């Protein structure tokens, strides 16, 4: 039976230490030797760069000691941690993230079977070499495209652009897809010696939007700003003016969208070359922030940033 | 054949590029007359009249165009049988809801856009506008609030949003579904919004020169509190949170918003999550902090309503009650 | 606390397997009392009473269970404040619509199922049933027709269907959306079905011992006409076509159905396509052949209505008019 | 510029010969040398085995004469032809199917740009080795999973289980996925010498369903029957009884579902080994019919049929 390490970070799946959780699902012993370590115990709305860094290091450092990783984490920023670990983890062994929408004590709590199926996925050899995974609602989702789609539904997690990698039925996975975008040990991002990441903020666009949020980030010397644009990554005029000024001033600018699916493209309404802006593609704003932070460890150059956004 | 007024505002529907097959295009360049004349069949369903109100990309929509549209619709109500408003897609969901809460005209107001410019191959704008006219002319379209018609579908202004960056099918009422489907110039209406709209709302914009100041702040891991603070220092009347999950906030964003709320800033919790209500009675004690839960309203839509709530009242429990009725 | 009657019929909600973590299970084995007692919190919201009506997999649902449910609900109307019906998922969409057209009780009838057996880990049945009771007890649930409650969502019997073979989230009203969302035992209703239901329909099953014979035939490339013919030779009163695309038929299926229609068999065009109306005025001249277009009704749902239409009339244009009002 | 062959079969995209169509889109000359041949001119509701066979042969025979194939076809059975060609085509060069929901003369007709983008996809070298494709509404969809989802919407075609392969913007495709299931020249199906296919019918399940359709197919000596089950491929009792009898009597039986997504699984309510039935997986009934017809050219054995359903 495979050796599987659970790294606990909190969330509503624990709404409680790694011990209790493991012990709540005695059927885990049917599929793996499960060992639990507590990294943190927080609601994922308070997820931060330091936790990210703790996790990337710990997985990379403990890779040879285990056959796989499950990370119990909150729902709220799961999609952001999944893609961070997707781009920084060097281990070629499965890393599977899982949470829950209802707590342990609620009617029809989703946590137990979620965990069961996260382990089935971490323990399956066919799960290797597909990047960092999220396993929720009987489904295996790549860490790049996965996002939460509904505020309360157990079925919230979806790969809303390119679809899931496979479905889990009766402790078995039929994989039919793997992400093409370069991930894990095919990426230049090496975070083993870093104690902090470049400062990247997100600003929202909408009608009559103020430029003040964007200005406060420029004023604070932020390394990057991600625009959550309207439509195909468009920007309200005040916001566009402030970011056209930040881009040439040592603040990288990534155009993403608040629209929940589809790529922000080049060649639409925004002359990106002319402003020194980067189009995020299908990366949603919080996702773009992950990749922007990590592109800034390698380079401050807009054109080389765009290339990274085109490859990872 | 009924009398329909097109109030044009721009958008990609009025967009042009130099090639039918390149994606590059510019917005707010083509006038209403060209739109009207690119749909030769409109004569069969209505006596159409265009007026260019502005000509912009909806990325640059703003309170003053809103005030201009509402007062214009309300003033001209008795000169026409219905309105179509051609408009960009990017903030269509915002304008549609603003109008849904402010038009007192009891004739259909139907917005419409296109995802491909008017120059492009298989441009979606021509049949979309045909279909917004059908809808505007249909007696059964009355008393449903303000509408958006795109891709053969009639959608209510409250729930409607854009779901994809390029897809002609982008416009969907993602929580409660469409009102009716359009086929052969006819509509099968199976729904009407329950929430109060139009002449059932207390909001009266007829003498308003401006709208209260409301900003939107985003939540994510390691979120800066600087955007929230910039809005607070500027004396904003309201702030909407685009929370994570069920309307949750990063600690530092939370702290800045709680303080603001004690000084009398209206603070609404919404969500960056694209479907589902930001609910009361979850991880935030709203009554403790003086916050308001947005319900199914996404952040840009909560802003519309919060701005309008702030013209009536500054009391958090009254703003809550408004966000439960409208 | 209101009085709620559970009428149990089986389903996976009443399903059991030998392991919590294997997928193998058997249906119609566990009685209503076990269901009720697996939701210890039901005492807080209603005085629940169970009656086992049958105990089957809904794969084996049939006209006689339909007639039994409708007459039972209609007879007992004044003994209770509402009904929950626990039922399999597989044909829930069919039973729900049959009831939606036949119940004359003006108290909520709410069906409910589960996608995992009651034995399984994180079984969905317990909270689903909790939530069908909330809904059945809610005054605002009245006058909406017959309902299905699953995965925190209240759905109308007409549009509701199962969209995935295993997903707990399978139940969706795919054309017109849900009626309301359930959170913390409360509902925000934003819609009601427009189509006529319950005490507004002419269908009266109270003295009926059986239902007219209606079969469903599938279309695909190279389709055999033998299924259509087997139904015609057996003297079926109606045949529903699960057409390709917008309700289109393979030539040989078409030919068999046209003939049947001239001899007085009712023939309804529906579609195997999972959303969108089978429309009039497309590639089939319905008036020419004496066929009826199903609208948004999928084939199994057109069957429900066709069977009921056939108790009133055999005239194709009257069957059309029924499929446009109900 | 690549050489691209358009094979015309009809449909509403031509609602008209291959000549007119090509000529309707003069911008085709920007991306390819386009040559058109007329195979048939029918509404795809009348698609049949003979057309399928004509197409598989013609593509396989003309492979070395061109750089790619676009097939203009009706919407109604596009998904069935795509998977047939997916499993029989031996050419390693792109085969792209396209149709339209509105005719040439309608407001905002979708045909012209649909065709434009089908050619962009047939002409792109990155499109090779992904199987038979369907390109509709700016999207590239694998032929196995693609299905029509709405009766009238231009956006009807979707890969509703595993998602699309890529999106087309400004004449370029960002591919992020490829089907894992074996296709084209990785399949044993060889149709070069066949003038007919095994007789396979489809029966529908629902409440109070008659066994007569199923019996009429057994009585006619059909090689296979596909059940469009309820839920996870369940069968009404009368239908179950008739098919339990056909399965041991020289009529292969495949359990599929009328439910528009998800796999029909083994290990649920139906003891498949015991009845000699095959679970279709994610193959919907009309799709299962394609694979069932072609599995019957190799074998009549239920257990070896199931294996093929597990691999292609
Ligand atoms: N269900 C959850 O996990 C929500 C919680 N706020 C978290 O993200 O930690
Ligand atoms: N499709 C569109 O109309 C997008 C455009 N930027 C607008 O909103 O004006
Ligand atoms: N999930 C379920 O309930 C499926 C079961 N076969 C039924 O419909 O009874
Ligand atoms: N739009 C279409 O292509 C429908 C037509 N009946 C066909 O499949 O040939």
């Amino acid at each position: 039976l495979p050796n599987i390490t659970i790294l606990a970070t909190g969330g509503t799946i624990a709404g409680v230490g790694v011990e209790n959780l493991v012990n709540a699902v005695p059927q885990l012993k049917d599929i793996a030797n499960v060992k639990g370590e507590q990294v943190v115990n927080i609601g994922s709305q308070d997820m931060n760069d330091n936790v990210w860094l703790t996790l990337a290091k710990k997985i990379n450092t403990d890779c040879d000691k285990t056959d796989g990783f499950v990370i119990t984490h909150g729902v709220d920023t799961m999609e952001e941690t999944a893609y961070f670990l997707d781009l920084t983890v060097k281990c070629d062994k499965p890393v599977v993230m899982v949470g829950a929408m209802r707590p342990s004590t609620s009617m029809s709590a989703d946590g137990p079977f979620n965990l069961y199926n996260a382990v089935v996925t971490a323990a399956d050899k066919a799960s290797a070499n597909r990047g960092v995974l999220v396993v929720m609602n009987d489904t295996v989702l790549d860490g790049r495209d996965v996002t939460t789609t509904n505020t309360t539904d157990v079925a919230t997690f979806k790969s809303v652009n390119y679809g899931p990698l496979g479905y889990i039925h009766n402790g078995k996975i039929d994989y039919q897809r793997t992400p093409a975008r370069k991930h894990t040990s095919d990426t230049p991002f090496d975070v083993s010696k870093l104690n902090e990441l470049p400062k990247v903020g997100i600003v929202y666009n909408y009608a009559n939007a103020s430029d003040l949020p964007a200005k406060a980030l420029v004023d604070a010397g932020y390394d990057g700003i991600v625009s959550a644009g309207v439509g195909n990554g468009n920007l309200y005029k005040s916001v566009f003016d402030t970011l056209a000024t930040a881009a040439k001033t040592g603040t990288a600018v990534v155009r993403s969208s608040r629209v929940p699916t589809g790529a922000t493209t080049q060649d639409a309404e925004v002359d990106d070359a002319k402003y020194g802006f980067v189009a995020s593609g299908t990366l949603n704003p919080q996702k773009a922030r992950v990749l922007l932070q990590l592109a800034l460890t390698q380079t401050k150059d807009p054109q080389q940033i765009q290339q990274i956004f085109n490859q990872y």
Side-chain angles (χ1 to χ4, degrees), chain A residues 56-210:
Chain A
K57 282 161 183 190
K58 205 189 199 321
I59 293 155
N60 284 340
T61 302
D62 304 351
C63 188
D64 31 35
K65 312 202 187 84
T66 164
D67 301 316
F69 293 96
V70 172
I71 302 149
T72 53
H73 188 292
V75 165
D76 298 352
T77 58
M78 180 115 103
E79 76 199 69
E80 300 176 47
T81 308
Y83 187 43
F84 173 84
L85 291 176
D86 208 27
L87 292 158
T88 53
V89 169
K90 307 289 160 183
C91 208
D92 269 281
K93 293 170 189 174
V95 182
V96 175
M97 302 187 71
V98 74
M101 300 295 274
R102 313 156 176 165
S104 340
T105 59
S106 73
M107 273 171 286
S108 292
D110 58 311
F113 194 55
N114 288 8
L115 183 57
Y116 186 74
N117 273 332
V119 176
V120 168
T121 309
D124 182 347
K125 70 170 142 94
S127 304
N129 297 109
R130 301 184 186 257
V132 170
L133 308 173
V134 168
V135 169
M136 292 284 281
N137 194 34
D138 295 11
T139 314
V140 185
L141 302 153
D142 77 274
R144 190 182 194 269
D145 203 40
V146 68
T147 188
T148 193
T149 56
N150 189 272
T151 59
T152 58
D153 187 338
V154 295
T156 180
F157 285 101
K158 286 302 224 300
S159 291
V160 308
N161 300 286
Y162 295 109
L165 305 191
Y167 295 94
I168 308 172
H169 180 261
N170 195 34
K172 288 178 274 154
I173 299 175
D174 184 23
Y175 276 115
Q176 290 194 36
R177 284 296 189 286
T178 189
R181 274 286 164 124
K182 302 199 202 133
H183 67 254
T184 54
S185 50
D186 291 356
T187 92
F189 314 117
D190 173 357
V191 181
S192 50
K193 285 151 217 197
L194 301 173
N195 297 312
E196 66 201 325
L197 296 169
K199 284 160 220 190
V200 179
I202 304 184
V203 288
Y204 210 64
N205 293 257
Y206 49 98
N208 219 109
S210 184

